[PDB]
Design an enzyme around this catalytic site. Structure first.
Site, PDB file in Angstrom:
ATOM      1  N   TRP A   1      42.072 124.148 -16.854  1.00  0.00           N
ATOM      2  CA  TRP A   1      42.617 125.296 -15.933  1.00  0.00           C
ATOM      3  C   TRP A   1      43.795 125.150 -15.765  1.00  0.00           C
ATOM      4  CZ3 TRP A   1      44.999 125.290 -11.458  1.00  0.00           C
ATOM      5  CH2 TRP A   1      45.180 126.416 -10.672  1.00  0.00           C
TER       6      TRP A   1
ATOM      7  N   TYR B   1      46.212 128.284 -16.715  1.00  0.00           N
ATOM      8  CA  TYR B   1      47.170 129.100 -15.475  1.00  0.00           C
ATOM      9  C   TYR B   1      48.457 128.783 -15.595  1.00  0.00           C
ATOM     10  CZ  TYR B   1      48.426 129.923 -10.774  1.00  0.00           C
ATOM     11  OH  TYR B   1      49.128 130.452  -9.556  1.00  0.00           O
TER      12      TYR B   1
ATOM     13  N   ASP C   1      37.992 128.544 -13.120  1.00  0.00           N
ATOM     14  CA  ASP C   1      38.571 129.056 -11.769  1.00  0.00           C
ATOM     15  C   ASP C   1      37.401 129.188 -10.618  1.00  0.00           C
ATOM     16  OD1 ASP C   1      41.090 130.039 -10.295  1.00  0.00           O
ATOM     17  OD2 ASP C   1      39.398 131.356  -9.958  1.00  0.00           O
TER      18      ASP C   1
END
Length: 282
Positions: free
Chosen positions: A218, A222, A238
Site C-alpha cells: 500500500w 500510494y 486501501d
C-alpha cells in the site's frame, strides 16, 4: 507573479478540499481560493502561494523573496502537486461513466518526493485526520521555522530525520518499526536511492521500494501515485477501497481495476470520491 496554464475542466473545490483534509499544521494553509505552504529547495526557503483563476484556467504562483532564486523549480513542484499536465478529455474519454460525476478531478501530487515518502509511511493503517496530526508533530519537532514568516515551519529535511532518535519519533504516536522506516527513508534520500522523480519503470521501482524496511505494498503504491504522480496505480489494500468493493480480497479488487488501465490512478480517486459507487456484476 508567475502563471501556469491548465486544460479545462479542473475541479478546484475538490482539489483544495483534498489538500485541506491532509494539510499539515504550520506547514500548509488551504483555503477556498488558494493553497499556500512553506518550501525549501536546497538552502532557499520561503512560502509559495498558488491562486487559481478559474475562468482564465491559469494558476497564479506567488513566491516570497527567499524562493525567487529557485522560482522555476518551485513552479515545477506546484505543477506536480496540481497535475497541470492533465488532459481531462483523454482521461474522461477512457474512464467513461466512472469519471462523469467529477470530470475535473485531478491527481493531487506533491512538492517533494522525500516528504511524500514520509507522509505515505505515516498514512499507514491510520485515518487522514490522524496522519495529518502525526505529520504535524514530526514537522514541529524536526522542522525549521522560516525567519521571515514565523507562523510557517518547513517540512523536516532528510538530514534531520536521518539523525532522529527512533524513540523520539515513536513517542509522537507511531510504532517503533514505523519510526525506523522513516529514518531509513531519510538516509535513502541523502544517498539518492529514493527516486525523486517518476522512474522510467514504475513497477520495477515500487518492487525496489518494498525492500526498504517498513514499506509494504500500500505504501509503495500510494507513494508512486502521489510521490511520482504515477498515473496507472490502484490501491487494492486501501481501507476505503475495500469498502467500495465489499467482501472482495485485494486480488479480486486488482483484477477488477485492470479495466481502468492505463489510468488506474485517476480511477482510484474517482472511486474514493464516489459515495455510492459499487462494482458491476459479471
Amino acid at each position: 507573479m508567475y502563471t501556469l496554464n491548465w486544460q479545462p475542466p479542473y475541479d478546484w473545490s475538490w482539489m483544495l478540499g483534498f489538500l485541506a483534509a491532509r494539510a499539515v499544521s504550520s506547514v500548509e494553509t488551504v483555503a477556498d481560493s488558494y493553497y499556500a505552504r512553506s518550501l525549501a529547495v536546497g538552502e532557499y526557503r520561503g512560502v509559495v502561494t498558488a491562486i487559481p483563476d478559474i475562468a482564465r484556467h491559469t494558476l497564479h504562483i506567488n513566491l516570497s523573496a527567499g524562493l525567487e532564486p529557485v522560482a522555476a523549480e518551485c513552479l515545477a513542484k506546484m505543477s506536480r502537486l496540481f497535475d497541470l499536465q492533465c488532459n481531462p478529455q483523454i482521461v474522461n474519454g477512457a474512464l467513461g461513466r466512472l469519471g462523469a460525476a467529477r470530470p475535473g478531478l485531478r491527481l493531487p501530487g506533491c512538492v517533494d518526493a522525500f516528504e511524500q515518502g514520509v507522509r505515505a509511511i505515516l498514512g499507514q493503517l491510520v485515518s487522514v485526520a490522524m496522519a495529518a496530526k502525526l505529520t504535524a508533530r514530526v514537522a514541529q519537532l524536526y522542522g525549521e521555522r522560516l525567519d521571515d514568516f514565523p507562523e510557517y515551519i518547513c517540512f523536516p529535511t532528510p538530514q534531520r530525520l536521518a539523525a532522529a532518535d527512533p524513540q523520539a519519533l515513536k513517542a509522537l504516536g507511531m510504532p517503533l518499526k514505523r519510526a525506523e522506516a522513516l529514518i531509513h527513508l531519510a538516509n535513502a534520500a541523502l544517498e539518492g536511492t529514493l527516486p525523486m522523480t517518476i522512474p522510467g519503470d514504475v513497477e520495477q521501482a515500487m518492487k525496489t521500494l518494498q525492500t526498504f524496511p517498513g514499506i509494504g505494498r500500500w505504501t509503495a503504491n500510494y507513494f508512486a501515485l502521489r510521490g511520482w504522480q504515477a498515473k496507472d496505480v490502484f490501491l487494492p489494500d486501501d481501507y476505503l477501497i475495500k469498502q467500495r468493493f465489499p467482501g472482495m480480497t485485494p486480488a479480486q479488487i486488482r483484477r477488477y481495476a485492470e479495466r481502468w488501465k492505463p489510468w488506474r490512478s485517476y480511477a482510484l480517486l474517482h472511486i474514493w470520491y464516489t459515495e455510492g459507487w459499487q462494482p458491476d456484476e459479471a
